[PDB]
Amino acid sequence: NRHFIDADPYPWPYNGALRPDNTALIIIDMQTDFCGKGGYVDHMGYDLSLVQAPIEPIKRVLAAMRAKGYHIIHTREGHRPDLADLPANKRWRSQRIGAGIGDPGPCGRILTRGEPGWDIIPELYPIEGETIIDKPGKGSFCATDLELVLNQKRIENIILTGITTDVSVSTTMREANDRGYECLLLEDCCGATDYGNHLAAIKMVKMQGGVFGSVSNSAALVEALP
Amino acid sequence: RHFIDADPYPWPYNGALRPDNTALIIIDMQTDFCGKGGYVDHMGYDLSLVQAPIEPIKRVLAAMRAKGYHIIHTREGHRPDLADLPANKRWRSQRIGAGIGDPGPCGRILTRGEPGWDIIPELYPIEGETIIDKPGKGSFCATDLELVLNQKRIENIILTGITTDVSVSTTMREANDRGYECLLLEDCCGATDYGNHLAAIKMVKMQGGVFGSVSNSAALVEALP
Amino acid sequence: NRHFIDADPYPWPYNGALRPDNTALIIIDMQTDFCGKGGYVDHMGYDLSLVQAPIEPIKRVLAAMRAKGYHIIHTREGHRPDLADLPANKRWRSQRIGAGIGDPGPCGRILTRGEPGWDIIPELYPIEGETIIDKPGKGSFCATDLELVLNQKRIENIILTGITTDVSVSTTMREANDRGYECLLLEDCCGATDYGNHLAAIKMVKMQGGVFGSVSNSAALVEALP
Amino acid sequence: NRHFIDADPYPWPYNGALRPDNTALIIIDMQTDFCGKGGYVDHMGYDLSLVQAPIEPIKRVLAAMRAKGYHIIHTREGHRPDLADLPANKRWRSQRIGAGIGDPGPCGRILTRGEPGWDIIPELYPIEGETIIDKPGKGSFCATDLELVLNQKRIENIILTGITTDVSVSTTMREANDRGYECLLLEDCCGATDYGNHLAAIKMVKMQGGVFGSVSNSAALVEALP
Ligand SMILES: [Ca+2]
Ligand SMILES: [Ca+2]
Ligand SMILES: [Ca+2]
């Protein structure tokens, strides 16, 4: 009963065991803070078009995987309003460059849970029955219930999308891969603060016969999704 | 306070740099990753890229040993029974002719107890230095690294070893997510692809030091308290 | 600069480093589901007076530690409304005995986040600046951000209270102790579904020169708290 | 194609999905330090017959599960020779009662990796293909690769044996249960420093319709093992 997605450096998933019941899409940190005007990334002066580029491709993948009954997971990087989960170094770095986590901005308190800027963008909003992971780090496994959730659902395969490619997306992929999950990175469904770093994070997956998994794109996924 | 000249900010961020709260970690300087006959060699990558950091790590190691800093070493590898080896990881390595567990000139590839898997003689651990044996790229995943760091009350980590974009970068991300303050020494790491090495380094610097800061062996040795 | 609380089998904390900045009270799972009429524990037919007994002693410890600026942590065992974090075995066991997690009861859906029965009882309600851990298991470290929070605050010492003694309280103490935290169990500030199991969980702490930490009571803590 | 083991409070595993490929025996900390003369437990003056009693029953369960191709896991509590993984409180407690971890005794350095006293006893020694977990705490999940190993092998069911019942065995069971694993405690295959604490740890499993899993014995397991 095998099915593959055309991918680089190998057809994904490795063993062809691609089904709705054992496969999840994860949409990482598609929040106003990371891709919208007035947010954290905007405050740092990075080019929002790099991180907005993946919105429509993720939209297409999301629609297709919803229609076929695949597990859908969303993440939000953010902190408790009391900032108890905010490392001192992380906070200081963000303040030094004028984008202080917890400080007020046009979208509310930066990367603070419950604030408008922190929420997932309307274009990729979750619907009921889709798990949201609230995380205080870049990696989606660190200090969350993601592993527990994945194991209860018996998820083996993860399709990664979202932003930023080299930070949250890459870290989540590394975490997942280290724990035995089989991951596909959709290159047109991520974007970064630096386009070269985006391309490099993608190439890093491919080395050593697919060290972190494999790489494809939104069109190829939609085409071959069972 | 004490600082090391680093990019994008002088490290550590708060100047709290002492022997008692700072560790060097030497990641995966094993024959499998940088020596002839090992895993990386089997894949056809250029061993000089991964051998380049040996002498600079040696200098940092000697200095930090002399000043009583905590020293940690890692080894990526698997139990002889391969119970800790994900099926996908194994399959990928077999597909490209460098199968984990399969026999080669240095023994079974990335298998604990085999010659190829051990730390190279140049950077061998001495008594009192903790070795982390890990089944993944990240040094926190499925190990006691966090426990060890917390018992010693380590706040600052200086990262060296190979490969820059795989084990080193993953370990840095893990550490940083948990609140550790990390310095990557750019001349003390190397990768399978030199551009990926440079990119992993540049990734640290974004957003005012998203994963920590970056320096080099000479600058560290010169300013180490 | 050392301070100790009279405890068994050794004066706590072991090294006398007892300060507001490095010490937290944790109040475990003082929810209607575990000690109130109509909840999970009531449904199973256990004697609510055993689990209600610790309310006033915890109240006294809470008031004292708040007044002296100690870190205060609360926990709630519970599940996401979609039950993504609910193991199949856990759910099945609870249904078999007529107290099914997620099923409707007089206080709402049993052990389901957002429901009246699941919330912390009014007597021990959190105030702003006190961290609440929402956990899908008995142990407060499993699949939560508790460790991350404790480490950012540099907490070394934990004073444990709440219910039930042999389940969530004991599991949390074991987790904390394994990771190097120095724990004090307040015996009059916990209670269980079986009084002998309560006493036994307490005695287990004391073996081997304090294998899990040490044991005291609410009066002794209040009297000697710096 | 369901199979059950006669157990209390419910026939185990809960869903009858009992197979060699998804079930592991874990033999916890059957080391000279915990059950042999000259070791840690002996130094504390506890009665070695309590902790030796389970040896022959574990032997029978081990032989049967080996013969039927079940996954076999062993654990060893212990510390690196440099004691980097040894919490200061844990060490201090052990020194206070004259059984200091790392200190020299008749079996070598107490609970120190590489020492004779620390190794698994010859009667229950591992054979090739059987995973050994080296752990610095009582819980077998804390700071180890146990979860990773279990997930790669797709283990759902765990049969727990070893010592001590109320410390390492119970903590491991709680950890496993919190993460969704289905656990059976074999009551004649464990023993403790206090026989009443042993019985209490066992009874704790049974509350609330099997809060931590279920309880059986070596004979019942061997007789019904598929
Ligand atoms: Ca060499
Ligand atoms: Ca930290
Ligand atoms: Ca600690």
PDB file of N, CA and C in Angstrom, chain A residues 1-5 12-13 16-23 64-70 157 159 220-226:
ATOM      1  N   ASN A   1       0.835  -1.246   0.000  1.00  0.00           N
ATOM      2  CA  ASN A   1       0.000   0.000   0.000  1.00  0.00           C
ATOM      3  C   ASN A   1       0.863   1.288   0.000  1.00  0.00           C
ATOM      4  N   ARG A   2       1.972   1.294  -0.739  1.00  0.00           N
ATOM      5  CA  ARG A   2       2.955   2.351  -0.638  1.00  0.00           C
ATOM      6  C   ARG A   2       2.643   3.566  -1.493  1.00  0.00           C
ATOM      7  N   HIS A   3       3.022   4.751  -0.999  1.00  0.00           N
ATOM      8  CA  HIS A   3       2.847   5.999  -1.713  1.00  0.00           C
ATOM      9  C   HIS A   3       4.015   6.928  -1.463  1.00  0.00           C
ATOM     10  N   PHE A   4       4.454   7.642  -2.492  1.00  0.00           N
ATOM     11  CA  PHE A   4       5.609   8.507  -2.380  1.00  0.00           C
ATOM     12  C   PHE A   4       5.317   9.889  -2.909  1.00  0.00           C
ATOM     13  N   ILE A   5       6.060  10.862  -2.395  1.00  0.00           N
ATOM     14  CA  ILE A   5       6.075  12.208  -2.904  1.00  0.00           C
ATOM     15  C   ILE A   5       7.445  12.418  -3.537  1.00  0.00           C
ATOM     16  N   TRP A  12       9.734  10.577  -0.735  1.00  0.00           N
ATOM     17  CA  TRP A  12       9.316  10.649   0.667  1.00  0.00           C
ATOM     18  C   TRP A  12       7.872  10.149   0.868  1.00  0.00           C
ATOM     19  N   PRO A  13       7.572   9.415   1.946  1.00  0.00           N
ATOM     20  CA  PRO A  13       8.511   9.041   3.006  1.00  0.00           C
ATOM     21  C   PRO A  13       9.362   7.877   2.567  1.00  0.00           C
ATOM     22  N   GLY A  16       7.492   4.662   2.028  1.00  0.00           N
ATOM     23  CA  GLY A  16       6.203   4.752   1.369  1.00  0.00           C
ATOM     24  C   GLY A  16       4.965   4.606   2.244  1.00  0.00           C
ATOM     25  N   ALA A  17       5.122   4.591   3.560  1.00  0.00           N
ATOM     26  CA  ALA A  17       3.978   4.411   4.480  1.00  0.00           C
ATOM     27  C   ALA A  17       3.355   5.779   4.739  1.00  0.00           C
ATOM     28  N   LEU A  18       2.667   6.300   3.740  1.00  0.00           N
ATOM     29  CA  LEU A  18       2.101   7.635   3.755  1.00  0.00           C
ATOM     30  C   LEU A  18       0.593   7.504   3.756  1.00  0.00           C
ATOM     31  N   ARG A  19       0.003   7.785   4.917  1.00  0.00           N
ATOM     32  CA  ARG A  19      -1.436   7.700   5.119  1.00  0.00           C
ATOM     33  C   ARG A  19      -1.934   8.867   5.948  1.00  0.00           C
ATOM     34  N   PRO A  20      -3.235   9.182   5.836  1.00  0.00           N
ATOM     35  CA  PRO A  20      -3.835  10.206   6.701  1.00  0.00           C
ATOM     36  C   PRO A  20      -3.658   9.938   8.191  1.00  0.00           C
ATOM     37  N   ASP A  21      -3.753   8.682   8.618  1.00  0.00           N
ATOM     38  CA  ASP A  21      -3.708   8.369  10.052  1.00  0.00           C
ATOM     39  C   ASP A  21      -2.308   8.510  10.695  1.00  0.00           C
ATOM     40  N   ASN A  22      -1.231   8.426   9.909  1.00  0.00           N
ATOM     41  CA  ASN A  22       0.125   8.469  10.473  1.00  0.00           C
ATOM     42  C   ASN A  22       0.965   9.656   9.993  1.00  0.00           C
ATOM     43  N   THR A  23       0.313  10.660   9.413  1.00  0.00           N
ATOM     44  CA  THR A  23       1.010  11.785   8.798  1.00  0.00           C
ATOM     45  C   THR A  23       0.359  13.091   9.228  1.00  0.00           C
ATOM     46  N   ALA A  64      -5.605  21.002   0.834  1.00  0.00           N
ATOM     47  CA  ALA A  64      -5.527  19.635   0.329  1.00  0.00           C
ATOM     48  C   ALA A  64      -5.462  18.585   1.455  1.00  0.00           C
ATOM     49  N   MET A  65      -4.652  18.860   2.471  1.00  0.00           N
ATOM     50  CA  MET A  65      -4.495  17.911   3.559  1.00  0.00           C
ATOM     51  C   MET A  65      -5.719  17.891   4.478  1.00  0.00           C
ATOM     52  N   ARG A  66      -6.376  19.027   4.663  1.00  0.00           N
ATOM     53  CA  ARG A  66      -7.678  19.048   5.350  1.00  0.00           C
ATOM     54  C   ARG A  66      -8.704  18.213   4.612  1.00  0.00           C
ATOM     55  N   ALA A  67      -8.786  18.394   3.296  1.00  0.00           N
ATOM     56  CA  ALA A  67      -9.770  17.671   2.496  1.00  0.00           C
ATOM     57  C   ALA A  67      -9.555  16.166   2.571  1.00  0.00           C
ATOM     58  N   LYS A  68      -8.307  15.731   2.727  1.00  0.00           N
ATOM     59  CA  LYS A  68      -8.021  14.293   2.792  1.00  0.00           C
ATOM     60  C   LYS A  68      -7.912  13.706   4.204  1.00  0.00           C
ATOM     61  N   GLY A  69      -8.307  14.463   5.219  1.00  0.00           N
ATOM     62  CA  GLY A  69      -8.326  13.989   6.602  1.00  0.00           C
ATOM     63  C   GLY A  69      -6.975  13.798   7.295  1.00  0.00           C
ATOM     64  N   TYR A  70      -5.923  14.497   6.854  1.00  0.00           N
ATOM     65  CA  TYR A  70      -4.615  14.406   7.520  1.00  0.00           C
ATOM     66  C   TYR A  70      -4.627  15.218   8.813  1.00  0.00           C
ATOM     67  N   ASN A 157       5.094  10.437  10.187  1.00  0.00           N
ATOM     68  CA  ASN A 157       5.556  11.337   9.144  1.00  0.00           C
ATOM     69  C   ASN A 157       5.105  12.749   9.429  1.00  0.00           C
ATOM     70  N   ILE A 159       5.141  16.735   7.745  1.00  0.00           N
ATOM     71  CA  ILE A 159       5.403  17.655   6.647  1.00  0.00           C
ATOM     72  C   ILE A 159       5.539  19.038   7.252  1.00  0.00           C
ATOM     73  N   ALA A 220       4.202  19.521  -5.901  1.00  0.00           N
ATOM     74  CA  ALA A 220       4.520  18.087  -5.915  1.00  0.00           C
ATOM     75  C   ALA A 220       3.801  17.322  -4.812  1.00  0.00           C
ATOM     76  N   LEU A 221       3.598  17.972  -3.677  1.00  0.00           N
ATOM     77  CA  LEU A 221       2.873  17.347  -2.604  1.00  0.00           C
ATOM     78  C   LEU A 221       1.429  17.191  -2.971  1.00  0.00           C
ATOM     79  N   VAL A 222       0.775  18.271  -3.401  1.00  0.00           N
ATOM     80  CA  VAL A 222      -0.641  18.225  -3.764  1.00  0.00           C
ATOM     81  C   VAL A 222      -0.901  17.172  -4.844  1.00  0.00           C
ATOM     82  N   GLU A 223      -0.033  17.114  -5.855  1.00  0.00           N
ATOM     83  CA  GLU A 223      -0.054  16.138  -6.925  1.00  0.00           C
ATOM     84  C   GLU A 223      -0.138  14.692  -6.534  1.00  0.00           C
ATOM     85  N   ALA A 224       0.678  14.353  -5.553  1.00  0.00           N
ATOM     86  CA  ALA A 224       0.903  12.939  -5.141  1.00  0.00           C
ATOM     87  C   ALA A 224       0.289  12.553  -3.795  1.00  0.00           C
ATOM     88  N   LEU A 225      -0.352  13.495  -3.100  1.00  0.00           N
ATOM     89  CA  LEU A 225      -0.935  13.202  -1.789  1.00  0.00           C
ATOM     90  C   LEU A 225      -2.061  12.151  -1.925  1.00  0.00           C
ATOM     91  N   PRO A 226      -1.935  10.999  -1.224  1.00  0.00           N
ATOM     92  CA  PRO A 226      -2.976   9.933  -1.303  1.00  0.00           C
ATOM     93  C   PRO A 226      -4.295  10.282  -0.612  1.00  0.00           C
TER      94      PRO A 226
END
